[PDB]
Subunit: 247 residues, 4 copies
Amino acid sequence: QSSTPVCVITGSASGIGAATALRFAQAGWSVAIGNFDDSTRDAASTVEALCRDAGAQTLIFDADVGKDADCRHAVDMVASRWQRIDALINCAGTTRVIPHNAFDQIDDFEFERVYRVNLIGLYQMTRAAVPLLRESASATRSTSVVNVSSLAGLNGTGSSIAYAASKGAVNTLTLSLARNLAPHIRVNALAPGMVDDGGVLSRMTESAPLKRVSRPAEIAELAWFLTAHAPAITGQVIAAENGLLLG
Amino acid sequence: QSSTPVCVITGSASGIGAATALRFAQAGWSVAIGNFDDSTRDAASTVEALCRDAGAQTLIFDADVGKDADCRHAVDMVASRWQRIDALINCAGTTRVIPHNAFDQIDDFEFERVYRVNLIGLYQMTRAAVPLLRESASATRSTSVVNVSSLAGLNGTGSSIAYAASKGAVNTLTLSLARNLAPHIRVNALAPGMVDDGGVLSRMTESAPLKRVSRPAEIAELAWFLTAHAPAITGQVIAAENGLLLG
Amino acid sequence: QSSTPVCVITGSASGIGAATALRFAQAGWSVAIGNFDDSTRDAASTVEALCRDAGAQTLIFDADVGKDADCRHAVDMVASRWQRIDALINCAGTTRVIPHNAFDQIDDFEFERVYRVNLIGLYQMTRAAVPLLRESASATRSTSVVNVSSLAGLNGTGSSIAYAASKGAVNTLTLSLARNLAPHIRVNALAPGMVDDGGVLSRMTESAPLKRVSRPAEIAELAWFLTAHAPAITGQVIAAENGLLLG
Amino acid sequence: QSSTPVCVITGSASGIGAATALRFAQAGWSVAIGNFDDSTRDAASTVEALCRDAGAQTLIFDADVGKDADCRHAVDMVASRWQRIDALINCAGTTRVIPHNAFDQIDDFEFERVYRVNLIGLYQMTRAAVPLLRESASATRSTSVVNVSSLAGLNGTGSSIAYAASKGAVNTLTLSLARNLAPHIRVNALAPGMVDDGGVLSRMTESAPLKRVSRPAEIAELAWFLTAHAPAITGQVIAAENGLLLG
Ligand SMILES: Nc1ncnc2c1ncn2[C@@H]1O[C@H](COP(=O)(O)OP(=O)(O)O)[C@@H](O)[C@H]1O
Ligand SMILES: Nc1ncnc2c1ncn2[C@@H]1O[C@H](COP(=O)(O)OP(=O)(O)O)[C@@H](O)[C@H]1O
Ligand SMILES: Nc1ncnc2c1ncn2[C@@H]1O[C@H](COP(=O)(O)OP(=O)(O)O)[C@@H](O)[C@H]1O
Ligand SMILES: Nc1ncnc2c1ncn2[C@@H]1O[C@H](COP(=O)(O)OP(=O)(O)O)[C@@H](O)[C@H]1O
C-alpha cells in the first residue's frame, strides 16, 4: 500500500468538494477526485491540476453515487492505485429551488431525486469505502468520514423541502454510522449556511449576525480539521452558518 | 359543514393510529379511519366499531399514502362527508428490521421503500389536507397536524438505518411545515421509544430508566393533547421514550 | 394519608403557578399553594379562593425557596396535612430586565440573585419533596416534577443574560434529576415563550409565527398533561413558544 | 500595539488551559498565561517556560476570575504589554465530586461556589476583554472567545449536579454572548468528555465508543481551530467526547 494517506472526495468537481480536494492536497495527502459525469469533467480536471500543483498525487474517478455499482467501482479504482483510504468526504449532492410554501410545485419524483444523491448515494459511497477505511485505521488513530449536510437539515429551511428532508436524514444517518463504525472510523457531518461558490451577496450578508457569507475553502478547513486533528469527535453535526441559528 | 370537529388518521388499522382514532372518538370528534389495504381492513373495521361504541361518527377510507392520488381521494371522501378537517394524525409507516452494522443486508430499494411511506407519503397526506385544515381554523384557534416519528429519528437507532434516516427527515419536514403553515395550522412530531402493540417485554423494560414500555394509548393521549390543548406548540418533536435518551 | 392526590406549586401567587394551582384544583387534586411573602399573600389568597371554588382542598404555605429551611418546612406542612405529594410544579422564579448588550449594567450580585431562586431554590424544593414523591409513586404509576424554565434557557434570549443562564442550568438540572429519580419520579421542564399575565401585546404577537401570545392557563395545561397523562415522558424540555424557535 | 496576535488563557496553570497556551505559543501567538493563586504558580511558570521554548512572548497574570476586579486588572496588564487581545480562552473552572443521587451531600454553598468560577467568572473575564477583542477585530476577520464547558452541561452527568448545572448555564451564556457580540467577536463553547491530565483509565476507555480518552492537547487543538480557521462558526457547543453521546 501507499505510504501517503488517501482522501476520497465525491462532488469534487466544484464547490465544497473541489475546495476540500485542494485542502487535502495542500496537506500532502493523495486525493481521489470524484467527478460526476461528462458535464463536470472539465471542472474536475482543473481541480486535479490545482491539487497536483499543490504537490499531491491524484486520480479522477467518475461516479453517480446514486448507483451502488458506481460507488464500488470508484473504491476499486482507489484500492488498485494506493490500497488505502484514510478519509472519505461525501460532497456529492443535488437540489432544485422550490419555495417551501409552493406545495403544488414539488412532487414525489423530486423528493426521490434529491434523496437518491444526498442520502442513498452518501450511504452507498460510505459503505463501499468502509472495508478500506477500517483497514487503514491504526492501533492509535481512527479514519474519518465527513458528510456535507446543510443548515437546512437542522431547521427545515433551504432550497426546497425535499432538500431539507434529505439533509435531516443525512444528520440521523451520520449518528447510526458513527455508532456502528466506532472505534475504527469516526463519522461527522457539516452543516454550512450560505456559501458563495463565486445583490444576492449583499442580501445573504446582511441577514447573518456575522455579516458575511462562507467561501468553500472554510468548509474544506473544517473537513480537514475533523479528519486530522479531532480523534475524540464522532457523531456530531457541526454548524458553520455565520450565526444564522442565532436569529 | 359538520358542526362536530373531524380528525383524519392514517395508519389507523392498528397500533398508534388505531389508539389515536379511539382517543379522538372518546373526545366526541368524528374520525376518518385510514385503512391501508385488504390485508388491514378487518382490523380497521374493528377500530371503527370501537370508535362508534365510543360515540363517534366514522368513515373508513383506503389509501396507500405513497400514492399522491390516494391521499387526494381520501381527503375528497372526508370533504364530501363532513366538509372540514380539524386534525390530521400521520401514523402510516413501514419498516423492516435490519441490523445497522449489516451493511451488506440493506439496499437502495429498502431506503426508498421506507422513505416512500414514512416521508413522501406523510408529506402527500399533509399537503392534500392543507386546504381544509386552513379553512377549518378559526379566528382564535389553529388546526393541528401530528406526525408520528420515532426515537430512531433523533439518535439513529431503531429497526434499520433506512428507518432511522426516514424519521430524521420527518423531524426536519415537520419544521418546514410548521414554519410555512403558521399561523393557521400547527405541525408537530412525536418520537416514541419502545411501544408494545400487544422476554422481549422484559428486555425493553429493563433498559429503560422508567422501567416500562409504552402502550399505544399513551401516544394517542399525546396526539390528542397537542391538538386540543396546545395552541402555542408548533415545530416541536416530543420524545416519549421512557427515559432512553438519558442513557 | 389522604385518598386524594396532592400537587405542590411554588410561585403559586400569580402567573403560571396561579394558573397551575387552579388547573390541578379543577382536576380534583388537593393543592398546596406556595406563597412567597407578605407582598404576594393577597394574590395567593385569591388563588386559594378560586381553587376552593373549583372544589379542591387547599393549604397556603410561605416559602422563600432560596432558603433550604423554607423548602423543608413547606414540605413538612404538606406532609402533616395530607401525608402525600403526587406532583411538584416549580414556578417560583425571578428576573430583572437588563439588555444583554449592556455589559456595564449587570453584575455578579444579579447573577447570584437570579440563580438563587431559579436554580438553587428549584433544586432545594425538589430535594425536599423527593421522599414523599417517591413514597407516593405506585407499582404502576410514577409521580411528577415539572420545572418552569424558559425559551431563554434554550436560545440565550430573554429578560437578562443572568436569567437566560439560570434557565440553561434549569434545563440541565432537569436531566440529572430525571436520570437519578427514575423510575419512581419523572422530571420535565417547560420552556414558555411570551406569556401575558394580564402595543406591547401587538409587538409580541406579530413577531411570533403563530401570531399570538400565551396565557398562563396554557402552561398550566401542559404541566397537568405531563403529570397525569405522560407516563413515558421524563428528562424533556417542552417548548411552548408560539413558533419563535422557527424564526 | 503589538504586531503579533495575543491569546489570553484563564485556567492556564494546568490541564486544558495549559495545553491551550502551548498550542497558541506553537502558532507564534503571544500568550497571557492566567494563573490562579500561589498554589498553582509553579505549574504556571512551567507552562510559561514551555511556551517561551515554543517561541512565544509571554506574561503571567494572577486572577481569581470570580472577582470582577481581578478580571479587569488582568486585562489591564495585557493591554499595557501588547495593546491587543485576539482570543480569550476561558478555561478557569472548579468542581467537587458529589454523586448526583446523594441529595443530602450537596448544598447551596457548593452550587454557588461552582457557579462563581464556571459561569460568573467566565462572564466577568469575557466582559473585561470585550473592548480590546472588538478593537482587535479587522475589516475582514473577527476575534474569538472559546468557553470550556463540558459534556456534563449537555446531558446532566459529570462530577456533580452543581457542576452540570453551571455548564448548562455556560452553554446558554455562550449563545447570548455570540448573538450580542456579533459580528466583531465569535463566541463558542467546547464540551469535552473524559480528559486524562496525566483502572480509572481502563474504565473510561471501555465505556466510550471510540475506546479512548482525550488528552488536553486535543481540546487545545479545537480551541485553536475555532479561533484561527472558523470565521463562520459562532454560538456553537462542540462536543469532543469520544462518542459517549451515542450511548
Ligand atoms: N448523482 C451524483 N453523483 C455524483 N456526484 C453528483 C451527483 N449529483 C450531483 N453531483 C455533484 O455533486 C456536486 C455538488 O456540489 P456543488 O453543486 O458545486 O455545490 P456545494 O459545493 O455547495 O455542494 C457537483 O459536483 C455535482 O456535479
Ligand atoms: N403505504 C402505506 N399507506 C398507508 N398505510 C400504510 C402504508 N404502509 C403501511 N401502512 C399502515 O401503517 C400502519 C403502521 O402502524 P403499526 O405498523 O401497526 O405500528 P405503530 O402503531 O408503532 O406505527 C399499519 O396500519 C400499516 O398497515
Ligand atoms: N425567592 C422566592 N421564593 C419563592 N417564590 C418566589 C421567590 N421569588 C419570587 N417568587 C415568586 O415566584 C412567582 C414568579 O411568577 P410570576 O413573577 O407571576 O411570572 P410567571 O407566571 O411568568 O412565572 C411570583 O409569585 C413570585 O412572587
Ligand atoms: N476562581 C478561579 N479563578 C481562576 N482560576 C481558577 C479558579 N478556580 C480554579 N481555577 C483554575 O482553573 C483550572 C482548572 O483546570 P484543571 O482543574 O487543571 O482541569 P481541566 O484542564 O479539565 O479544566 C486550574 O488551573 C485552577 O487552578
